[PDB]
Amino acid sequence: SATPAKVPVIEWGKCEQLKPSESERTSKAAVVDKCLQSLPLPDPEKATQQEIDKHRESVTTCALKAEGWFDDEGVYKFDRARNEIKNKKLDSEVEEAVLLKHDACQKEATEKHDDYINQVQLYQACMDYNISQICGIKVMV
Amino acid sequence: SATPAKVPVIEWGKCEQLKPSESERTSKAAVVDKCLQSLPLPDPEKATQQEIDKHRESVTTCALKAEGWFDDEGVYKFDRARNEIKNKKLDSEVEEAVLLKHDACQKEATEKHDDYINQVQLYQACMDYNISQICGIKVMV
Ligand code: NA
């Protein structure tokens, strides 16, 4: 095809439960597409890397805000994230290790950053890395 | 979320007709997941860039083969790709321009490369660039 669909290419290791469902994927696309209506993509013929990076940030924040991830003080809902991991029903030994890294990643994020957006950015990066390590997940880049 | 779904972030410009449906997206995931059961991701502790690149090429080949995109000799079905563009029902001026590029991308691919896989790789990159330009499509990297 001249227009192939692009999908993630991931081996889930010990953690097949973390693979998004078709439904979860369709949900997220709807959120992102709505965010893009207000946050159009920068012109790649003209945009600077900084403009691209800050626009990307704005879309990630939009999707988290639209789906309820910040409280009335603007703080990311770390306890919601924890409960969502428990709801995946990982194998018990993996769950325990992931939930310990949740605490470690929340601590790292909150001690490094006072900015609530920087906190969630570092927490998500921290969990992407640590979940990948615990689970043996490989992602094609 | 500690495990957000990752989705394309694209503005489709003049060419919303090219956005994959949920069905098309789900089929491509099913094909890629089946391809990975035989074409495992290389271990980044050990993998060369050549091994990583050749593995990525194999997944693309695998998914194209699963969907019927090669004849029995191994040649990519360029005329199928051409007819699939016409069946998108783009605006007439857009279609005209995209089909001129299809023919020119095919001719470049076959003149530059004798390897059938190299031919489809060049054609798809050529069409990604040219369809994006004609349509005004922006894709977040
Ligand atoms: Na915990």
Q: Give, in order, the Cα–Cα distances in Å from A140 to each of A11, A12, A27, A32, B135.
A: 9, 12, 23, 22, 28
CA distance, residue B120 to nearest chain A CA (Å): 9
Q: Residues with Cβ < 8 Å from B50, sequence gap 6 or more?
A: none
B84 CA from centroid of ligand 1 (Å): 50
B106 backbone dihedrals φ, ψ, rounded to 5°: -60, -45
Residue with tokens 């691209």: A52
Range list of β-strands (E), A1-141 = 10-11, 138-139
| Residue A138: its H or E element | strand A138-139
Give every CB contact of residue B23 below 8 A, 6+ residues apart in sequence. Answer: none
Q: Which helix (H) or strand (E) holds A10?
A: strand A10-11
H or E segment to which residue B139 belongs: strand B138-139
Beta-bridged to residue A138, according to DSSP, are A11
The amino acid at residue B29 is: A
Structure tokens at A93: 């030994």
Q: How many CA atoms lie within 13 A of B135 on its CB side?
A: 27
- How many whole angstroms from B117 Cα to the centroid of ligand 1? 48
3-state secondary structure of A71: coil
The token pair at B46 is: 């050990």
Q: Do B3 and A85 touch (CB under 8 A)?
A: yes
**Under a CB-based contact definition with an 8 Å cutoff, are residues A101 and A134 in contact?**
yes
Cβ-Cβ contacts under 8 Å, B28 against chain A: 4-7
**Alpha helices, H only, chain B:** 22-38, 49-66, 78-87, 92-112, 116-135
> What are residue A139's phi and psi, to 5 degrees?
-125, 130
Helical pair B116-135 and B92-112, crossing angle rounded to 10 deg: 150
* Residue B39 DSSP code: S
What residues does the ion ligand 1 have nearby, CB within 5 Å? A 99, 102-103
- Nearest chain B residue to A105, by CA: B2
Angstrom distance (rounded) from CA A7 to CA B6: 9
- CA–centroid distance, residue A83 to ligand 1 (Å): 9
Contact (Cβ atoms closer than 8 angstroms) between residue A101 and residue A126: yes
Alpha-carbon distance of B102 to B106, in angstroms, equals 6
Q: Which of A80, A76, A59 is nearest to A118 (CA)?
A: A76
Q: B17, B90 in Cβ contact below 8 A?
A: yes
Beta pairing partners, A11: A138
- Domain B10-139 maps to which CATH number in 3.30.200, 1.10.3470, 2.60.290, 1.10.238? 1.10.238
The tokens for A79 are 């306890």
Residue whose C-alpha is closest to residue B33's, from B81, B70, B2, B66: B66
Asked if B10 and B139 count as a contact pair (C-beta separation under 8 A), the reply is: yes
Report CA Rg, chain B. Answer: 17
Query: What's the CA gap between B1 and A116, in Å, rounded?
Result: 14
3-state secondary structure of B100: helix
| Contact (Cβ atoms closer than 8 angstroms) between residue B36 and residue A11 | yes
CB B76 within 8 A of CB B123: yes
Strands A10-11 and A138-139 come out as antiparallel
| Structure token pair of residue A56 | 């990307």
**Which chain A residue has the Cα nearest residue B24?**
A5
Tokens of B2: 């500690």
Q: Which two tokens stand for residue B114?
A: 């004798």
In eight-state DSSP terms, residue A16 is G
* Nearest CB to B1 within list A8, A29, A81: A81
CA distance B131 to A102: 43
The helix/strand/coil state of B134 is helix
List B10's β-bridge partners, or say none.
Answer: B139
For residues B140 and A110, what is the distance between their CA atoms, to the nearest angstrom?
Answer: 29
Q: What is the resolution of this structure in A?
A: 1.2
Classified as helix, coil or strand, A11 is: strand
| Distance (Å, whole) CA B101 – CA B15 | 15
Helix (H, G, I), strand (E, B) or coil at B115: coil
